[PDB]
Design a protein around this ligand. Structure first.
Ligand SMILES: COC(=O)/C(O)=C/C(=O)C1(Cc2ccc(Cl)cc2)CCN(Cc2ccccc2F)CC1
Ligand SMILES: [Cl-]
Ligand SMILES: [Cl-]
Ligand SMILES: [Cl-]
Ligand SMILES: [Mn+2]
Ligand SMILES: [Mn+2]
Length: 179
């Protein structure tokens, strides 16, 4: 478990609230990426993690003149180009809905206008795993139509253990409390 052992080594050595806070964010990012790999594997789709919107456009429409459009330089996690429709994909790991709503609004308002200008049928798709219950939530009707079941086998226990160890090391640290 080289990813686990690297985190553990960092948790053993950390002494300051600011370095611990970076450890915490790093753990949350790695558990998010773990879900993305596992999800794409279960669905047997190409795994990507942050593709520049400009690059997505060139992949689906090679003859595009990028400079004739105002392309927001967002980096959604992944996409599916069926040949007829573009599914923009972002992974989430959270017990709650709020981060899904933030990214939904952002990618709806920033990606959909230019894609309609370009002429590319696009759907914004956000796939959330609850890290405690392993239940999967999907926004994106065409994604659900393409993938009615998702046979993932998720275990988030090790990410919770690492983060709990770090939070317990700093549970009497006022600074870290705030961060
Ligand atoms: C869960 O879905 C996302 O949230 C997502 O995939 C976010 C990201 O890709 C970034 C890395 C990250 C991944 C998972 C977690 Cl847990 C935490 C962080 C990298 C891209 N930046 C976008 C950005 C870039 C520059 C300025 C402001 C910004 F918002 C967000 C974090
Ligand atoms: Cl430190
Ligand atoms: Cl110090
Ligand atoms: Cl982005
Ligand atoms: Mn991302
Ligand atoms: Mn994401």
């Amino acid at each position: 478990d080289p990813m686990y052992e690297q985190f553990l080594q960092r948790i053993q050595a950390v002494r300051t609230a600011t370095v611990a806070k970076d450890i915490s964010a790093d753990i949350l990012e790695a558990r998010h990426d773990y879900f993305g790999r596992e999800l794409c594997r279960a669905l047997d789709i190409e795994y990507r993690n942050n593709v520049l919107l400009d690059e997505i456009i060139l992949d689906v429409y090679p003859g595009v003149n990028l400079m004739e459009y105002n392309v927001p330089h967002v980096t959604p996690d992944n996409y599916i180009w069926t040949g007829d429709m573009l599914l923009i994909l972002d992974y989430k790991v959270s017990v709650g809905h709020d981060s899904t709503e933030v990214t939904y609004k952002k990618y709806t308002t920033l990606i959909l206008p230019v894609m309609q200008e370009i002429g590319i049928n696009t759907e914004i798709c956000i796939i959330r795993a609850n890290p405690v219950t392993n239940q999967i939530s999907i926004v994106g009707e065409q994604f659900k139509r393409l993938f009615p079941t998702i046979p993932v086998e998720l275990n988030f226990a090790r990410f919770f253990e690492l983060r709990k160890m770090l939070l317990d090391k700093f549970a009497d640290d006022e600074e870290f409390l705030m961060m």
